[PDB]
């Protein structure tokens, strides 16, 4: 199950947003435009599969297909592309606002029944499963007055109908943020605009669930668990192929050539070998593939190993989050509810032979019960399950000389304890993004609209400790009781 998320944004046209908010600051129109650049960038950098359409109401002209009065669409339900961003961004500020108004409409009345009408009819046209659906609003009206109470009541009925349908309403204050001046009676028909503005960048999410793994703890019992890859790098957008000016990719006829015939290597004519001493030891890719067969894809459990005996010096591939499940074998999660309840003998690690893929050797792994740290705000921290650390082999070692050469004086430990105690970090995990990847993103948006570069910054990986030293006190230099400086 994947689904989708349909998002539509509506703006009135009554000069209540074409106005400058009685300030040199951004207009409600302009702040909505910056919000929509933020939304479009966020959608592009995240899964862009979601469709976004542009529709405006309260307008002198009509280009909605239904052609009801005071409704003017611009964009169909499409993934936000570069051209969409340019065509919406060409209409902002005073000059963009006025040209947009003369090509769209400078402002007129609202017909709520008509707009709910057209939204239901349009959302009918979706041809795919819809995981979520939401409509965000940004309008200054406290409550419907211009429309008669008949239109307000029928809009209330349709609003209840759509709320039961699944779609929900969102709004923010416009006349004055904070307090309560908006939705006094929209309280019945039912900062934060900054979050709708540009706040979060380089987003991505996954709704998948890795395959059912079969615990081969013994020949008699094989059980079903759900593995889950919970950590991996986010990658570089692919250099998909193109052309100088026609802007068109290339295929490939990549095949190794043979001096004998004008043709290429035949799959027989290509033949594997290796120089061992005086031998071109002769094999094929088939033989090398056949060599690596050890046993079936799965975990061939050697057995439990008391986790009370454990070490931190060894390190390997980042861990894998296994989870209890009952997919194709019964009683699975019945016994999976066990082994997470005791930390005296059920915390015991599981030294296991684990083959992840067909035709793969067994790889040593160990189990850690990761108790659902269900955060107090319900945010199940360290979700309920298993942290799996892959165990070393006898080639994870390059020998090191002994460095136990000194155990220095207590004066040095005291001074550097004083030094380091003045700095402690709450360990915010999200505190540093990828500056390299974000800089590549910035190169992309530079090539997007017109910029030589839109943003020239680091993701805060640069050392602020040039100001921490005085914050900690320059005493770090006077706590050098060292007679000779190391860096000379």
């Amino acid at each position: 199950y994947s689904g989708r998320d349909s998002l539509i944004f509506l703006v009135d046209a009554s000069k209540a947003m074409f106005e400058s908010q009685s300030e040199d600051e951004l207009t409600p129109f302009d702040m909505s435009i910056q919000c929509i650049q933020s939304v479009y960038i966020s959608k592009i950098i995240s899964s862009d599969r979601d469709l976004l359409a542009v529709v405006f109401y309260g307008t002198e002209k009509d280009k909605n297909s239904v052609n009801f009065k005071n409704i003017y669409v611009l964009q169909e339900l499409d993934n936000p592309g570069a051209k969409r961003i340019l065509e919406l961004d060409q209409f902002k500020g005073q000059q963009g606002q006025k040209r947009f108004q003369d090509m769209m409409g400078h402002g007129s009345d609202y017909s709520l029944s008509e707009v709910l009408w057209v939204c239901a009819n349009l959302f009918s046209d979706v041809q795919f499963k819809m995981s979520h659906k939401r409509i965000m609003l940004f309008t200054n009206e406290d409550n419907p007055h211009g429309n008669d109470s008949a239109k307000a009541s029928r809009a209330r009925t349709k609003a209840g109908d759509l709320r039961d349908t699944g779609i929900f309403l969102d709004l923010m204050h416009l006349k004055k943020p904070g307090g309560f001046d908006i939705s006094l009676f929209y309280r019945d028909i039912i900062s934060k605009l900054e979050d709708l503005l540009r706040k979060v960048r380089a987003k991505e999410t996954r709704k998948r669930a890795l395959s059912r793994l079969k615990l081969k703890l013994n020949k008699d019992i094989v059980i079903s668990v759900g593995i889950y890859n919970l950590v991996q790098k986010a990658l570089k957008p692919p250099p998909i192929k193109l052309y100088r000016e026609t802007n068109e990719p290339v295929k490939t006829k990549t095949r190794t050539f043979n001096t004998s015939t004008g043709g290429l290597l035949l799959p027989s004519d290509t033949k594997r070998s290796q120089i061992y001493g005086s031998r071109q030891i002769i094999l094929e890719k088939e033989e090398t593939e056949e060599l690596k067969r050890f046993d079936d894809p799965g975990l061939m459990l050697m057995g439990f190993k008391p986790l009370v005996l454990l070490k931190k010096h060894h390190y390997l591939r980042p861990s894998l989050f296994v989870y209890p499940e009952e997919s194709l074998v019964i009683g699975s999660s019945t016994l999976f509810s066990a082994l997470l309840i005791k930390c005296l003998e059920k915390e015991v690690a599981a030294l296991c032979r684990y083959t992840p893929r067909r035709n793969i050797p067994p790889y040593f792994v160990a189990l850690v019960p990761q108790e659902e740290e269900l955060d107090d705000q319900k945010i199940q921290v360290t979700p309920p399950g298993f942290q799996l650390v892959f165990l070393p082999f006898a080639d994870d070692k390059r020998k090191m000389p002994f460095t136990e050469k000194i155990m220095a004086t207590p004066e040095q430990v005291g001074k550097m304890k004083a030094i380091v105690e003045k700095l402690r970090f709450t360990y915010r995990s999200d505190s540093f993004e990828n500056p390299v990847l974000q800089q590549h993103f910035r190169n992309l948006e530079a090539l997007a609209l017109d910029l030589m570069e839109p943003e020239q910054a680091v993701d805060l990986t640069l050392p602020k400790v040039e100001a921490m030293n005085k914050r900690l006190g320059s005493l770090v230099d006077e706590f050098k009781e060292l007679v000779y400086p190391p860096d000379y």
């Binding site: 998320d5 966020s42 959608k43 995240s46 979520h132 939401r134 979050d195 706040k199 979060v200 987003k203 999410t205 709704k207 705000q377 319900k378 945010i379 003045k422 700095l423 402690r424 970090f425 709450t426 915010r428 999200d430 505190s431 540093f432 993004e433 993701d459 805060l460 602020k464 921490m468 914050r471 900690l472």
Partner: peptide, 23 residues
């Protein structure tokens, strides 16, 4: 339930970066 990302409900509303703190 609250605490879910507005763009992708079911995944968490992650607070933005805050850098390193000095205590």
């Amino acid at each position: 339930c609250p605490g879910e990302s507005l763009i992708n409900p079911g995944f968490k509303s992650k607070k933005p970066a805050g850098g390193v703190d000095f205590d």
